[PDB]
Design a protein around this nucleic acid. Sequence first.
RNA 1: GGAUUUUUGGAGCAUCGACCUGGUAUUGCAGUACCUCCAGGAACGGUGC
Lengths: 80, 83, 162, 95, 106, 82, 78, 383
Amino acid sequence: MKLVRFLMKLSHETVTIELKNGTQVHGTITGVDVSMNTHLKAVKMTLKNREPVQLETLSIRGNNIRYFILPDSLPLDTLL
Amino acid sequence: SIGVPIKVLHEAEGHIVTCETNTGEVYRGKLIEAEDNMNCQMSNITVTYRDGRVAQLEQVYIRGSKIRFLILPDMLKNAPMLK
Amino acid sequence: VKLTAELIEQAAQYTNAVRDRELDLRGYKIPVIENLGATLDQFDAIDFSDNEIRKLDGFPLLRRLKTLLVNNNRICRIGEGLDQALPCLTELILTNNSLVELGDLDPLASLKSLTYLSILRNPVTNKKHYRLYVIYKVPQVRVLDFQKVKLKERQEAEKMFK
Amino acid sequence: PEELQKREEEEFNTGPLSVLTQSVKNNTQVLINCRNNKKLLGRVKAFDRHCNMVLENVKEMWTEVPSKPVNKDRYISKMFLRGDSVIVVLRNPLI
Amino acid sequence: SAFDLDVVKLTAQFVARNGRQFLTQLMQKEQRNYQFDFLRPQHSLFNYFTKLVEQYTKILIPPKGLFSKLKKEAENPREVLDQVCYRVEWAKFQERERKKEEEEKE
Amino acid sequence: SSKMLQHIDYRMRCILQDGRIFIGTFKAFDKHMNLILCDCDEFRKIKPKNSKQAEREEKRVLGLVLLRGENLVSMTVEGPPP
Amino acid sequence: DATVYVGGLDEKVSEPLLWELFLQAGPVVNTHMPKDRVTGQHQGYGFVEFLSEEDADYAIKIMNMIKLYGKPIRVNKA
Amino acid sequence: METILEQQRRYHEEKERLMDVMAKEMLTKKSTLRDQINSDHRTRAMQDRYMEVSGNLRDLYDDKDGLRKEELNAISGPNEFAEFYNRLKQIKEFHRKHPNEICVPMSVEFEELLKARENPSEEAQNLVEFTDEEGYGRYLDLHDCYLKYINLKASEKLDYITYLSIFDQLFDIPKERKNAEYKRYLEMLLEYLQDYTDRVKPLQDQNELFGKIQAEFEKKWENGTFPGWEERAQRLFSTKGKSLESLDTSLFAKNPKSKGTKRDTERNKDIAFLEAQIYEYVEILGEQRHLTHENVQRKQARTGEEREEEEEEPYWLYKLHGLNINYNCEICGNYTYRGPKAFQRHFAEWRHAHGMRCLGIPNTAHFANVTQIEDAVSLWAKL
RNA sequence: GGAUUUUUGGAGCAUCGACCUGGUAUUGCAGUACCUCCAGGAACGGUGC
């Protein structure tokens, strides 16, 4: 099975998406598509050796995201 | 189908646009014909080579794999496709 | 009518002729400039034509601003904390003001990144040695009242008031 | 359909990702190398055809130069890694 | 109604510093050609003027802040919570007494 | 869903892969993460390369800009539609 | 001044019945009974407009002890 | 300004309104834990505002002792009152009533039906001080602390149950060394536990509890709080025994015990204070830790579906009938009518009769199609 | 939805834009890359190696 369907079934979860170019955005993921497009609201983004800025809304692409970090209160058996 | 930025880039042919390469070079010229895969064919192009040295080349063709951005002129801002 | 955030949110913000973001606020007659922090540093030029601002003060911390247009007003006094709020100021348009004394331009030398200034149509320019005092106060300004600085004018400014 | 799912199961059990099938058989920790020189040690809970892995109780270690670089590492409870940044996947690590 | 309220507050402040019931700073003002309709008890504003005079008299207490400082109401949240619980218990007792009076009337 | 079309024609800032940020009115988008930013301005930070020099960001306005999806990293909202 | 409001009437009372009951004290020029068109039932109130204000006041003053269907009907000036 | 008369009475009225709002909040019943926590936070904010108002009113007594000699004097009086009445004799052209003299503090200390929040506490939110895993004081988040302990220990042989069993000890032997790098994680865990204890009970006096904890750490924990029957007296900083009380008193002021060690009372005093605060937070909030351990055991023992369920908790009718057509009726105050048939039905109505009775024209059939007042007057005069 | 143009990896030197001084011709109606030339100083900055 594809792993995009497990990531698409995530709403109102405070996750942390680490991008490829040293960027890490931690926030509540509000929308996910089949192309791994992560639309989050009220997130905090920290770049490579930069100050963590805060944004009201962010839309990270699928090819620009490198890794994801989910909370510990998230079962993986029901999402797969 | 065809995308709306792809249709905006195809409708911008015949005017002076400015494509940007992946190595930092910006080539500004008259876009003769465009493609759906961001292929920019421009005449009277001005290459910069990421150092400001703008040389005048003729019949340049930049592929869509290295095309980072495409500055369109302000005359196409009132297009009905963008609404 | 006082200036608030509703007057700044309903104003027309677009691209000016100098390829910069400018918000038009002409025809308001605001007696005091306040609550200008609603732009979230998304503008580079602020126009304040046809205003009744008696003192140029109350400016929030804006780093993206690079041009100030305070022409056609009645500004008699100038604020002192202008360099701490606009560190990237480059253009200053203070034409048609009520400046009479030469000490009003003494906080205006606090801006280190200022290179453009306009103090035309003012009673302070009618006094003697006004341009020499303006050159000796702020040496970083390169264009004063649509005129470039001179080396002989800089020598006369460094020689005078010794 | 069912035949495509059976072909995908055969390609996951007998193909190159069969060592990844060792990650879901005995729940053993695997070592995955990233593009930013960060080695992640941990078992894989879910996988796909595009090498997208779901790691549980993973430890990500890397070398950061302040001199001599130190082995600064972190421990995540649950994480997801895309297949584009995966370089080398080791089934049985040393330690 | 701000001027009438200010005049009533001034009358309550001038009447609270009196040394007698009839020898006040407002009884002599009635004979000094000063029209004050709030001094008569027949008006509806007299009930508010009496409450303002009672508040001005309670503001001159020795634990009201003239010669002493309150420490239980100003430096003890537990005492304020106990006072709020006692006020809630008194309100519940008053509601129970009102319910008993309504049941007796029924 | 339609999460990408909800922020259409607004003053959005998209971060590029090279570190630059293009702020403009994103009027048109596509499935390939393309963006058509009218009156766009691109800002790129420059390295100080010294001990006492500060970090500056050169910003240049281009107008209508067609940004592809291979260079765009993340897009954030910055300002309401005028 | 010549209109009197009658309240406290049941829903079973009709407008010719109210006109015949109001005719015992004086001739009523007009009788308006507001009722809901969705349900077809009256609201228990009506307006009787006579030819003069004195006759309407005499009809409102003499209808203080009227009982219809066990309910007392009240008359007020409107 | 009447700072002793008007300002003190205003502060007393504000304190009485705050006490009445606190009594109305305490008398009302609660149904949820988050709403009760928000009500407790609003009551703590109101108590802090009342304490600030009492501290501001308690300092307005310097000039009162000098003004009480002139205020209580019977020789003065109506002269200054007549001067103040002449000063208050300005223009009364501002015809506007202000009923918000006492109703505005009553409405500011109240809540609405859509949101049970006060007017100073309208911007307060329970999501800005507590996480989703805590549950507004129901449980404690210990995943990040367990991850930090697993990163510091550099071993994957410690699960959540083992970390909960190691964290449950108060006076037992520690799992790591006292002079190691575990104290930097223990200080952060104590700072998190102190914020969790301060967030679980906002109505309690945190300053008095901190002063009592500091007094218990200074007077008791620094003088041998754990007696024995080397085992008679133990030191928390030096981690060494003592034969008797006299030897411990002689070694308490020693040179290795003051600053001649790496775990003396000079540098390792803050770590000992953080350990004492963590022990006090574990002893005071042991029931919350037991509830969090039971919730973690219930989440670990459940399946995937049970964990997912626990984690989720018309123009045609207006054009054919002649509607939407503006018609002016000058008889009934130049009213508007949206139909000819509607105007013909409203002409023989009570409103048109009441409009025509003002001019003196009786309600007849001759004035049915009359619109102007002059034409109706001419038709009434012709008959 | 995984195989060359966009979404599961290639992973001190060269040049341009300015800053300040003198001579020099054009006084001209357009939506434009750019925009006369020479000489002197610079202790201004970006890009790749």
